[PDB]
Amino acid sequence: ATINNVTDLAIAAIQWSDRQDLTQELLMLFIGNTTDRLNRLLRVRENEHFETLMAFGGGIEIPEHFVALRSITGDSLIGGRTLQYITQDIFTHYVNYNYQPQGVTYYTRLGNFWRVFPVVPDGAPFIVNYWTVLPELSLANPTTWALTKYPQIYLYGVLEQIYLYTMDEARSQFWGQKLERAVMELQNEENAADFASTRLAIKDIER
Amino acid sequence: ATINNVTDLAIAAIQWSDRQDLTQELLMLFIGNTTDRLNRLLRVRENEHFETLMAFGGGIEIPEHFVALRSITGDSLIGGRTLQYITQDIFTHYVNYNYQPQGVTYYTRLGNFWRVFPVVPDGAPFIVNYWTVLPELSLANPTTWALTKYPQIYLYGVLEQIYLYTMDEARSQFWGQKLERAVMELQNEENAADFASTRLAIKDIER
Amino acid sequence: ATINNVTDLAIAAIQWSDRQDLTQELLMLFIGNTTDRLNRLLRVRENEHFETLMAFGGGIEIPEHFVALRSITGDSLIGGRTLQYITQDIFTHYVNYNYQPQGVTYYTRLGNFWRVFPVVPDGAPFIVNYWTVLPELSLANPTTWALTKYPQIYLYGVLEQIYLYTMDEARSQFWGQKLERAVMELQNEENAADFASTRLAIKDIER
Amino acid sequence: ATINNVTDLAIAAIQWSDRQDLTQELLMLFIGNTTDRLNRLLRVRENEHFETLMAFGGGIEIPEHFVALRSITGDSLIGGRTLQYITQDIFTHYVNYNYQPQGVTYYTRLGNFWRVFPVVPDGAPFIVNYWTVLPELSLANPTTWALTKYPQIYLYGVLEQIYLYTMDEARSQFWGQKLERAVMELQNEENAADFASTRLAIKDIER
Amino acid sequence: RSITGDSLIGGRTLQYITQDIFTHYVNYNYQPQGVTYYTRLGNFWRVFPVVPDGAPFIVNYWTVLPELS
Numbered sequence A, B, C, D: 001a002t003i004n005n006v007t008d009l010a011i012a013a014i015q016w017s018d019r020q021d022l023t024q025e026l027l028m029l030f031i032g033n034t035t036d037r038l039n040r041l042l043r044v045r046e047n048e049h050f051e052t053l054m055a056f057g058g059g060i061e062i063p064e065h066f067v068a069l070r071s072i073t074g075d076s077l078i079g080g081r082t083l084q085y086i087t088q089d090i091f092t093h094y095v096n097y098n099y100q101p102q103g104v105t106y107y108t109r110l111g112n113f114w115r116v117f118p119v120v121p122d123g124a125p126f127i128v129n130y131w132t133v134l135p136e137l138s139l140a141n142p143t144t145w146a147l148t149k150y151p152q153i154y155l156y157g158v159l160e161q162i163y164l165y166t167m168d169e170a171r172s173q174f175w176g177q178k179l180e181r182a183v184m185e186l187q188n189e190e191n192a193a194d195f196a197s198t199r200l201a202i203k204d205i206e207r
Numbered sequence E: 001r002s003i004t005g006d007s008l009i010g011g012r013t014l015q016y017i018t019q020d021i022f023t024h025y026v027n028y029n030y031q032p033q034g035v036t037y038y039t040r041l042g043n044f045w046r047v048f049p050v051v052p053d054g055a056p057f058i059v060n061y062w063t064v065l066p067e068l069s
Helices: A006-017 A024-039 A088-097 A145-149 A151-165 A170-191 B006-017 B024-039 B088-097 B145-149 B151-165 B170-191 C006-017 C024-039 C088-097 C145-149 C151-165 C170-192 D006-017 D024-039 D088-097 D145-149 D151-165 D170-191 E019-028
Strands: A048-055 A059-061 A068-074 A106-110 A113-116 A124-131 B048-055 B059-061 B068-074 B106-110 B113-116 B124-131 C048-055 C059-061 C068-074 C106-110 C113-116 C124-131 D048-055 D059-061 D068-074 D106-110 D113-116 D124-131 E002-005 E037-041 E044-047 E057-060
Touching (some): A006 A024, A088 A106, A151 A170, B006 B151, B024 B151, C006 C024, D024 D151, D145 D151
Antiparallel strands (some): B048 B124, C059 C113, C068 C124, C106 C113, D048 D124
8 A cells, every 4th residue: 555665665765755857766875774773673573583593502592683672482492481690690600509490591692692590401392482673674685574565664764864964954853853753653652553552461470 | 425436536536636647556556555554554444354364283374454453352252252463482381381261261372373371282273453554555456444434635635645746845744744643533533432531440351 | 874984984974074185094083083972872682782791710711802890600610600799808707707698799909800708719611702803994994883883973973083184173973872772862862772672570580 | 002102292283283383392491391291180100100218217218210109018037018008196196195006007198208107217117109290201312112112292282382371362272172171081991991881899908 | 867787687767887897896896686787988988787798778869850961
């Protein structure tokens, strides 16, 4: 609907800005800038992936497209528990004192790796659920879910970038405010779509 | 009543804006933008659908037009209860400790699926009541319930989009404020239409 | 993506600022100034290094690229504990009174060295995790992780430097605010990437 | 990196200020003024010196480049304690009443000397850790650590001095604010580099 | 009036740039997709993304009046 691919977005931007001097490279740069700005703000269902990873050398390697972490779950063969975050001091104390819980329970971050306390042999599987970065929008990849969901976001971002390029201040701020409002609306709608109309009761666990 | 289909809306927009240089494609883009903006705000009776889904692989697939969830109810053969939301930690703790309630009682969101705790065999029926997105308004779909219910919303949205296109600010803000007021009025009337004139007493349940 | 190397950044700066009198040396100076400014603000995953160091003369030599310290951990052969910071007076009192703890436990800073209280013989290994400075971007080093992760930071910094050079105030403040906002967004995302969506429980250690 | 020596700094100042009437003497005066201003504010690792001094005539001579004192420690031959500051009245009372502690414990300042209470024979060694003044920057000494670390400080200081010389007000304040911000950033980064990311416990001593 | 590239070589309407911009683009290896820029040197129009010989262009311009004799 509305904007279907990158070419339609470029045509709409040219029509709305009324600037015939824009080349393909500048439009691609503007679209890339908008996508990179979006990468730091959006955490939605379409941005979420869960997959199975293997533990090597007592640690799990962070995925290359990782931006934020939702959950890490052990496999049923090693307990099947949801891991909890601990600091380095707690990790060291637990290792030194031989805490010995039932299964893999805790994790921490060292460098580019996640280290689990009850050190497991190599090949232990884990289920990691995490958010990733938005797909690239360009001539090679002319369609993305972000464009198909809320095209106003990309349109307003491109317009703001264009007016930034032509050394204009007021219109750039106007379009930036519009883009921020659209992004906030989308994020709030995604946030309130799970349990905003149901009942909550508080449950008790033991970890 | 008042505005009947897309052609009347386009004619009214042309007459009110007094702009004879607006092509069909620009008007379609404006209408699509207004509909997309409305999709994130309205939660009314006409936007609400309830239907029966089948659970496969211990999960329920979210519908493609889903925007917000109202309720999930198990079928009478598997308990006939209303599910309650729980987090991932509670889910995995219940699975590990074999909580074993009477029937399907809890649900959680993983990826694009809803997982129920008392895992059921494939083919379990559920009744899901949820809100969808507004129907697409175009030449192929000349009439929608949104246009018939309150045409001023679409008229004001199209006018605001037009004045945004022609690089104007004050009139755009004026029409945007008018559209927001109309949307708020409609939403409030829909909200206060069920029990705003009756008596409430508070009841006790057990879950 | 977007901007890939230093030459693309220079071309983009030339196009956006619309200044044909900028030589290569001025652009290199602007980029270097932006890098030095970033060196005092960013503490992210790509800036983190952990490595093994030898204790010579009862002290550990601070690395030359060190900017901030994250943790120091003794090797398992000498206790395998996470060191804690103490002042000079506490160190002197512990030395005088022969405190005699189990293993290496405390550290302090003297000059350009880290001194550990349970004095160890020369050659004791430690694991130091710390932050370093960003790689220098120039003709000899055309690609860095900072440019690839978020090109808007470098673009806005270079533009701000350019407008500072041409004796302009309003545009310089504008671009400085944009750069600061981008840096804050990146830092906040990196800060929240770890455990902003998990559960915390508070644990007890012994030190 | 960026600015490597004094000549490059002078060239950059001439280019940025766009003033061809500046002579070598004026530039050296500006650089000296900036260094003198910096000497009153910076207390960093590179400014720190610890060395052994011999007490003569019951006192220790203050070093000629001393700007601020960090610590004074007695040698292990005379107790190896960290001295504490006392006023003149306490010193006189302790001398008169023959307090007689174990080793050298207290010190005070008289004129240009540090006097220790448990008067020791001449030749007693002490370890003094203190801050000095920044090295001079001129033709004879064209490279200093301060220029290498954060060249923006010197560049902004020289620009502010230049605009002060030409009887301008707004630009001088602008560049002075920039220089102050840079100095504050450097000082904060140096301050938070020791234990801002570790744990603190509070320990007990006896003095 | 106008210069346009052939669709095979990019099909872009060329834009005028000065000599300094041309030199900067050449030195920094801008490398766009097709031919986009041009400048005037002597009696020639030089296009920036240097193309091998035999690249057709469509030029629209004004001529002199025909001779009456």
